[PDB]
Symmetry: D2
Subunit: 505 residues, 4 copies
């Protein structure tokens, strides 16, 4: 009757769908990470404390606008709000900090432009500030090499459409053309740098500010990721790089970007400008599918609950979109304007928590785990065999949680790629590991502050008891319930090889 | 192959099918999911209705929550004018259905300060006076508000939530009276005129078919509507009531039950058994039950209708932002695609086409997304699952239908041509969800109109007289469908198509399947 | 109570493990028996009297073994098979076409006569010495000390330590001294040594030709005697199949070549052999001496699977009911082997000594008919059809789409039959490839088509004797009505039942595109 | 390349068959138990030693013939040959002893069409003539109706009841009718006692002689199993009861029998006489499937290599039968007259070892494990969750073994139920647990003879390193290979460790 368990048992996907019950309450735990873009409507400490209580797991800093002093104050407020709950480690919720780069752009130098008018695209810098309905200037000097006869040029976020030292185009879709407008070249392999000079400064600032992850704009190839990783350097070697896929090139060359990256962001907003909007769902389902196949985190972003910027309730499409991103297999869901500038940021966070939790119970785990189990490679890695063994055992006994002791998070990540129904309580002493764990579906990172015991067995048993107390206090399970515990054979990362099926004391 | 997501189609698992979805894999011309457009001030001119049909409109929905019989009668006349302007060519004529959506048991507010456009911005925490006095029915303000539910105080109690204007305004009950309610504005906002009111935790004792619904159903029978979308169906006896109201003269009108509340979801199975189809009416359903649970109700209803072989329509706020913007949000593109993937036979446009600034853009967008989503369907597991529902039937027409769908997959058929009197033979094929479009040739124009309720059916209306030799009449109808597929870009000469015919005239005799090349 | 019959409860199971759990001894099978029975004809079954009873008991193909006997001997056998077959031609409703198959001798190694006699036997004891000679003065003078064989290149292919197997590999010898014209051996396993016994050299690389001059004359004799098929012995490569195909020539181009996989090389080069051949025989007798006996079931499942995947006939052969040579009832292992061969996917099952020289040849044919009928209902068609469907999911051939639609329609209505009008047999073979549960009643006017239909599982061929009717719709209806009367009288279905009918849109072969779901009149 | 691993990775059963390769060698481990009926041809200590070397796991004693003194001397010789190898626990193979009871029996020229009269009056008890037939089953007319079939002497003669303290039959299939022959009543609910008078003494003797299991003959209902269980009593509470299904009623009431029993024997001999021989495979596949579903031992028996009683090589049907029983899911395969009275007993055992080892590699483990898990209930048992988690991990790392420390055998049986490809090395200090482990597919029982170390961690590591030494010595694995180890964690098997073999 609870957690969609009747639909969980179904032999077919059709019968699974038929049994979905609105009167089958979900469990307490919400596995999907919620990333909130911080802005005017949420950057105070008082609002941030409420965002954390509502469900925020990651604070996203949009570096498209704002100064370094502005972003440092936002980060400072995020940490003050986060540490206001640090007195109780049993209830403490780690909150990660993410840096979203601006990236390279193509800008124009108000007229009207009509369907059928002739428009010449010039590169000569004399008409840099003399743009009109006959001549238009752009700052991307390599455009004629990347463009061809028939190619389309989009101006002002796809509001204007054109068709090809200079270019001769015909206006397909018109509108009011203003100044310093963004340009997009659908299907073109653009040679803009992986990181602009501003991106270099912003990435170095993120290292100084101790950020957990970087959402790298306009990633088109593996070498773009490699450039970001070099700018982060030794000091930022542990910062996760999430590559944003925003154009045809990034979609077509997805597999090399995924291998080079720590994770992926389906940047639907920019992707929907470059590619036909009716195709974005294909790119979303393809990338979520491949990231789940590779065990790499995937973020679904843009306009998930857009109407909540002005309204306290989302539309029916918006509720459906959050649910379907979770059903697809997205590790995280994102709020942009909804939390940055909207009138109901707290309501937006709470809505994402409610939909995500409902959706996680409606996942067809029976076929999901069979397929992941089948497509899993046969290897000699003991941690990989332990992790699959733990997820298999967690389904057999319907455990309250899978408790994992982890230093770097890898052990908890290896369990998360198998998509257990049971929450993964990852106990760590590393605060960055705790913050970064939010990028992986199903991980509840708990930061142990107790000092290291001299008897290693006692230190392990201490951390297992901490996970039991966290699970009991947070309503995940109670005394007598069955849980799975993962530990290793010696201290240090890389030794997780032990699985126990144990009752809660 | 690099088209229609045929590489994804070949996957052995659902995970690999998702991994293979390709943005560079173009779909076939045909679009299977029906598009229902609510007709209104923005789209009721003949000029706009012609462009609506060219953009994709299959069904014209007339919402009886607003407007008089004269207004709706003119809209229906304009729909028929737009539709018949293409009748000079039977090879390119697209049948258009007319749907009457009932008002149902609605609770509504009055007019703000005498005008239907004036708005009073309510604030959070402010006290409000709900009145049942006909004097304040047109002088509604930020302090006093009139509604038309008279039995409100007996069904509602202190502490209950009262929702106003698509649930966007919340009012908690503090005090009650004979002709009044004292509430606290939990969620404030601009309160306009003639807005809907909801009471989710209430035993609303309103009638199944109200005096206005009786009048509207009668007007629908005189106007020859194809289908009724019955608002707020709570149980099977509500469906039977609408069926008895329509009587003999409305016996052929299809009844689509709208599921908009908890009781409807709970008693779904009996409602489905009595109805001709279902509408997941997400608008009210999202206020009546927690909004985070609407997707569960949606998928449960689409799954159960697909299992029972009955049409299901996904409705409300699919492309809502397109009322003001020419492009939808990413959530809106996703919702439409996901409804098609779930298995919805039809998708609906409400304010987007009835009152918005971009009605044709919304229709075209719904067409573009549906066709992309249809190719993305994992037909391999879907057909495998539908075949196992009733693995052994004694019906020879059912055996013929599944054999034709099996053959259509085998030869990646351009179409399944079906000769049908009542629509049944085409409906029987549509229940198996073939990738190939179904060209249903009929001489019954009501059948051609109603066919749009079933996913994949392209009704074509043969106008030629009945030939004396029945074999020549069959070959005349089959040749007309070949002409339709060619002119509409579904297939070309040489292509392989499936043909379903009977052994004698009349319904229920479809037993012949032929794999024939296009002449 | 329909589900209580033909294992339909087990058929409806969502898992193979649940399908096994639902297998019911009280669920009676249909009258139809899809797997073809091939009987080797010999002294116990050579008479017209016993051959009529073979046909009544279930024999579909008469196999003539060319390892023994002259052309004169095999001409009389073919005559008696055609006599017993045509003794039922008077009533076409009950006539059952019987095919004739010629099994070549091939590169075989045989011993000579024991003491000048064909029936004489001697006792070989364990550890004793046995000299193998190539000297023709001992050809009809073999005994416990000296054994002669016809393979003149034996000393060059074997060495000290080599194992030589005699008489179905029951007698084993180990080479202790290799001589200039002889081999001194030690009897590893002894027993009764008879005359003209087969010899196997598993280690050795025997250089005998694939198509010897005897095989060229035997194949040419088969063309003259209008045989339906050839069982080509010891096929090791595609070029061997092409040699048999060349000897048969244009005059015997419609005769089917079934390649017998009997050694390691045949198994290794299996894929090229299968593409070049019309069918495969899993010749377990020689294969289980050439390769370790415990690996034979691996080759059997591999070959049946690949033939089902390729849409080509596959026969399972040798020792299926071996104890029935001396006993009226089989062992439990024999009952299990016949059932598991049908469960694996073999189109045909075979009988060697059980019908060629045994004391109960009719009881052996009847037992194969009873077990195959039970194993056929027990097939898990749900997963089988799904896997077969996924092999070539997109085709341009309209008849391939028609065939698959007819099989899908036959499962939906659990039809009593799939009636197929066919000239060449292609349309019936296309249906049989999808493995329906329903028996395929193939109506044809071609007698060779009718006999060759037995190579494919489920095809019940009926020979139409009526002349071609003037109106083509009237000719189709006459042949459909003939199948209706065949099924009715044979117990496959009754009036009111639903059957699937496959016909063409125009006269001639290659136009089967019409499927009708009709009730039995 | 080895172990049919190309075929193992196939997406479909059809692709899996296509990939079976005769050149793909199996691992040295052979998972299926081999039960050998010991008789005049195999009861000498020296022959028994060779039978153990050839692969015998269980010595079966057919109590249908032979005195208690004869059978106890066979048991003495089996233990003598078994214990000759005890001086090396790394190579020592435990050997179980089974007692097969005789069971309740019905005892007595004909022509097809003749009128034969069955009489119940003891007047014709000594007059065994071909005109009237006497049976010693007094309730014969109450269990057979008009139209029923009566089989005489292993189903050589069949009769049909036409009239009904007497029966007027018509001989359906005739033959030569002798005296003191066996009688079988197809499809009848015979009310013969669950255990006859000799069976009780035989079962008592079994307990006296410390037998590991009993194959209870002619089990028709659950109460029959309960009757055997009562006779064995408190002294025989650990002896496993394997019910032999030999007739229609046993096949029909199989679910109630399996639940009451410790395991099942598919006694194809008698079953083939009671039901049509062409249906015996349906009953075998049903019983193996239900036993696999229930996690209870199933033994396939009778005529598996029958020709090997006189010949050194088996027929193709026999080689096929053994492989197909292993592929179906039989935990054990049996040899009757092939090892008890045949001329090639060692060759019969060696052939079963070779066929089974090839057939275990040919198992389509991918779909098997998926279906066992789908059909498995969501229990809160921690040992079941650990067992299933160990089997999943063993497939993921293709481990050389699942090492299980067990006292009673339960935790090794729980792993066996999920049919891992890897051998299950069960380390025990209980000699009866070591012997009985042979009933469960994939368990190689190793009897640790070392004293219990005072430090618990050192005791667990002695038992684990013993399994490591056993594995290397037997060829199951080498240094560096990954193994799965199941232990208790604290001084209730609930811990799984993935470790390289040292
Ligand atoms: Mg509504």
């Amino acid at each position: 009757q609870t957690q969609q368990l009747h639909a969980a048992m179904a032999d077919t996907f059709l019968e699974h769908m038929c049994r979905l019950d609105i009167d089958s309450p979900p469990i307490t735990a919400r596995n999907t990470g919620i990333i909130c873009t911080i802005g005017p409507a949420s950057r105070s400490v008082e609002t941030l404390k409420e965002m954390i209580k509502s469900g925020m797991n990651v604070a996203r800093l949009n570096f498209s606008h704002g100064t370094h002093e502005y972003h440092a104050e936002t980060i400072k407020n995020v940490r003050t709000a986060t540490e206001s709950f640090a007195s109780d480690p049993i209830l403490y919720r780690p909150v990660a900090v993410a840096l979203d780069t601006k990236g390279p752009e193509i800008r124009t130098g108000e007229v009207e432009l009509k369907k059928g008018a002739t428009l010449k695209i010039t590169l000569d810098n004399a008409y840099m500030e003399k743009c009109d309905e006959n001549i238009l200037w752009l700052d991307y000097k390599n455009i004629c090499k990347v463009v061809e006869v028939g190619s389309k040029i989009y101006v002002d976020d796809g509001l204007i459409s054109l068709q090809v030292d200079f270019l001769v185009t015909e206006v397909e879709n018109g509108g009011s053309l203003g100044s310093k407008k963004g340009v997009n070249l659908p299907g073109a392999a653009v040679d803009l740098p992986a990181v602009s000079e501003k991106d270099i400064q912003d990435l170095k600032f993120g290292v100084e500010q101790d950020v957990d992850m970087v959402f790298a704009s306009f990633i088109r190839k593996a070498s773009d990721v490699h450039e970001v990783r070099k700018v982060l350097g030794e000091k930022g070697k542990n910062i996760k790089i999430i590559s944003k896929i925003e154009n045809h090139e990034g979609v077509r060359r997805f597999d090399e970007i995924l291998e080079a990256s720590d994770g992926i962001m389906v940047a639907r907003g920019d992707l929907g400008i470059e590619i036909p909007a009716e195709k974005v769902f294909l790119a979303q389902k393809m990338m979520i599918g491949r990231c789940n196949r590779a065990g790499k985190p995937v973020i679904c972003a843009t306009q998930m609950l857009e109407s909540m910027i002005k309204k306290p309730r989302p539309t029916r499409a918006e509720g459906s979109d959050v649910a379907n991103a979770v059903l697809d297999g997205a590790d995280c869901i994102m709020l942009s304007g909804e939390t940055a500038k909207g009138d109901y940021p707290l309501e937006a966070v709470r809505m994402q928590h409610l939909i995500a939790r409902e959706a996680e119970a409606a996942i067809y785990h029976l076929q999901l785990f069979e397929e992941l189990r089948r497509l899993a490679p046969i290897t000699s890695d003991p941690t990989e065999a332990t992790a699959v063994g733990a997820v298999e055992a967690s389904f057999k006994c319907c455990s309250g949680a899978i408790i994992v002791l982890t230093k770097s998070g890898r052990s908890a990540h290896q369990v998360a790629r198998y998509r257990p129904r049971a929450p993964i309580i990852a106990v760590t002493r590393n605060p960055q590991t705790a913050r970064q764990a939010h990028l992986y579906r199903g991980i509840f990172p708990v930061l142990c502050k107790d000092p290291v015991q001299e008897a290693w067995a006692e230190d392990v048993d201490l951390r297992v008891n901490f996970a039991m107390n966290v699970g009991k206090a947070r309503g995940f399970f109670k005394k007598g319930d069955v849980v799975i515990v993962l530990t290793g054979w010696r201290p240090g990362s890389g030794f997780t090889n032990t699985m126990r099926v144990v009752p809660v004391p």
